[PDB]
Amino acid sequence: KPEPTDEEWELIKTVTEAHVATNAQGSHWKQKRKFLPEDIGQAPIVNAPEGGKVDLEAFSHFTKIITPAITRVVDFAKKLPMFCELPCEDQIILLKGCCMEIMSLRAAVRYDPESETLTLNGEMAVTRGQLKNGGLGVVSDAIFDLGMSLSSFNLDDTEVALLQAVLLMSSDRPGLACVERIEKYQDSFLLAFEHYINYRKHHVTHFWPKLLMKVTDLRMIGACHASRFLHMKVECPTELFPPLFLEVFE
Ligand SMILES: CC(C)c1cc(Oc2c(Cl)cc(CC(=O)O)cc2Cl)ccc1O
């Protein structure tokens, strides 16, 4: 099992630092996180159909921190030379495509089995029901389920950073111009990722193949979020949507 080459180690240092610099982790999250009051997201009438409705109050707090979350995803990408040398038209398509896949991953790795909450933007700990009622619906469940199964993977800033790069460099997005050049960058990351996996020597058989399944989960989530955004537009007032939010998922 080949370990990373010299060139791969340099790339690895590039993504890892890119991720860390944009992951709102100056201080460990488990300490800076404030819990969103239990009241928020709580349904007063228990027997009233939930359907696909949205808690406006909860939705309100979420949109207030979604913009800085979206920006860090942009800043992360803009720290990778491979990405910056892609046409601006491709940079847009790629960002609108992986934004939620990377954000969901970033939330999932910050899952706390104790309180059973996800820490968003590195400071807001929410429960499954809060994020579910607040707008995401089933997508909330998808992310929590992912966070539950990621705990044993013990992913470091590098493994998480490489996962983001793989998600970012997806050439299957519609309208992309440099499909080949993007697919190549993705191969370069996948390769460095696997080699780094051999270097880490995790005590779990078929760790790489199990990791790739998680990558498929995030792509399913990001796509499900797309259809979910449309619904939010119907259930929630247009004034509550930040211009950055609209731009990335419109
Ligand atoms: C309810 C709606 C506004 C909404 C919330 C939402 O929750 C999140 C937020 Cl704010 C931030 C992150 C990433 C991070 O922790 O940096 C990750 C996640 Cl999952 C994602 C998409 C959405 O459309």
> Which residues have CB under 6 Å of ligand 1?
59, 62-63, 65-66, 69, 100, 103-104, 106-107, 120-122, 134-136, 143
- First-to-final CA distance of the chain: 43
CATH of domain 1-250: 1.10.565.10
Question: How far is 250 from 230, CA to CA, in rounded Å?
Answer: 8
Directed axis angle between helix 157-168 and helix 88-108, to 10°?
Answer: 140
CB 139 within 8 A of CB 230: no
Q: What is the 3-state secondary structure (H, E, C) of the chain?
A: CCCCCHHHHHHHHHHHHHHHHCCCCCCCHHHHCEECCCCCCCCCCCCCCCCCCCCHHHHHHHHHHHHHHHHHHHHHHCCCHHHHCCCHHHHHHHHHHHHHHHHHHHHHCCEECCCCEEEECCCEEECHHHHHHHHHCHHHHHHHHHHHHHCCCCCCHHHHHHHHHHHHCCCCCCCCCCHHHHHHHHHHHHHHHHHHHHHHCCCCCCHHHHHHHHHHHHHHHHHHHHHHHHHHHHHCCHHHCCHHHHHHHC
Question: How far is 218 from 236, CA to CA, in rounded Å?
Answer: 25
Question: How far is 115 from 208, CA to CA, in rounded Å?
Answer: 29
Tell me: is residue 106 an annotated ligand-binding position: no
Contacts of 129 (CB under 8 A, 6+ apart): 41, 140
The token pair that represents 138 in the structure block: 């089933």
Cα(95) to centroid of ligand 1, in Å?
15
Cα(5) to centroid of ligand 1, in Å?
36
PDB resolution in Å: 2.7
Which atom belonging to ligand 1 lies closest to the Cα atom of 63? Answer: 3
Contacts of 197 (CB under 8 A, 6+ apart): 159, 207, 208, 211
CB 59 within 8 A of CB 33: no
Question: How far is 165 from 239, CA to CA, in rounded Å?
Answer: 33
The pairing of strands 117-120 and 111-112 is antiparallel
Which atom belonging to ligand 1 lies closest to the Cα atom of 54? Answer: 1
User: Which residue in 120, 116, 113, 119 sits closest to 128, CA to CA?
Assistant: 116
C-alpha dihedral, 94 to 98 to 103 to 107, nearest 10°: -150
Tell me: is residue 200 an annotated ligand-binding position: no
Question: How far is 188 from 4, CA to CA, in rounded Å?
Answer: 11
User: Domain map of the chain by residue range?
Assistant: 1-250
CB 18 within 8 A of CB 161: yes
Residue closest by Cα to atom 19 of ligand 1: 104
Mutate to test the pocket of ligand 1, among 36, 62, 146 (most ligand atoms within 8 A of CB): 62
